[PDB]
Design a protein around this ligand. Structure first.
Ligand SMILES: *[C@@H]1O[C@H](CO)[C@@H](O[C@@H]2O[C@H](CO[C@H]3O[C@H](CO)[C@@H](O)[C@H](O)[C@@H]3O)[C@@H](O)[C@H](O)[C@H]2NC(C)=O)[C@H](O)[C@H]1NC(C)=O
Ligand SMILES: *[C@@H]1O[C@H](CO)[C@@H](O[C@@H]2O[C@H](CO[C@H]3O[C@H](CO)[C@@H](O)[C@H](O)[C@@H]3O)[C@@H](O)[C@H](O)[C@H]2NC(C)=O)[C@H](O)[C@H]1NC(C)=O
Lengths: 48, 49
C-alpha cells in the first residue's frame, strides 16, 4: 500500500503528531494503523 | 513526619500561555532607561514554534 502526498498534505513534515490510516474493505473489519511520528531521521524513516 | 499533607497544590500552567502574552509585558526601569524583558524563548522546526 503506498500513499503519495499532494501539494496540500505535503506542505510541512509530520513531527510530534499522530497519523492514522484506515483501510476499510466492503466485507470484514477495517485495518486501523496509527503512529505517533517523531522527527524523521532519513530519506526514508521507519515510523511504525 | 511533620503531619503536612496537601491533597492538591497545583494551580497554574504556562503551557496555556503564548510568548506574545508575556514577552515585552514586564519591564525594568534602570534609571532613565526602560528595558522590555523576553521571558518565553522560542525556536522553529518543521513549521512548528
Ligand atoms: C515594552 O513594554 C511596554 C509595557 O508593557 C509596552 O508599552 C505598552 O505598549 C502597548 C502598545 O504598544 C505600542 O505603544 C508602546 C508604548 O506604550 C510602544 O512601545 C510600542 O512600540 C507600540 O507602539 C500599549 O497599549 C500599552 O499601554 C503600553 N504599556 C505601558 C505601560 O506603557 C511596549 O510596547 C513594549 N515594547 C517596546 C518596544 O517598548
Ligand atoms: C506582578 O504582577 C503584579 C500584579 O499582580 C504587578 O503589580 C502591578 O504593577 C503595576 C505597574 O507595573 C509596572 O511597573 C513596575 C514597577 O512599578 C514594573 O516592575 C513592571 O515591570 C511594570 O512595568 C501597577 O500599576 C499595579 O498597581 C500593580 N498591581 C498590584 C496588584 O500591585 C507587578 O508589577 C508584577 N511584577 C512585575 C515584575 O512586573
Amino acid at each position: 500500500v503506498m500513499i503519495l502526498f499532494g501539494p496540500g498534505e505535503a506542505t510541512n513534515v509530520f513531527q510530534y503528531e499522530t497519523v492514522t490510516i484506515q483501510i476499510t474493505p466492503n466485507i470484514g473489519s477495517p485495518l486501523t494503523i496509527s503512529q505517533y511520528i517523531y522527527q524523521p531521521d532519513g530519506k526514508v524513516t521507519v515510523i511504525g | 513526619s511533620r503531619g503536612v499533607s496537601l491533597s492538591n497544590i497545583y494551580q497554574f500552567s504556562l503551557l496555556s500561555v503564548l510568548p506574545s502574552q508575556v514577552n515585552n509585558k514586564v519591564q525594568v526601569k534602570l534609571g532613565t532607561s526602560i528595558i522590555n524583558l523576553t521571558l518565553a524563548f522560542s525556536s522553529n522546526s518543521a513549521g512548528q514554534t
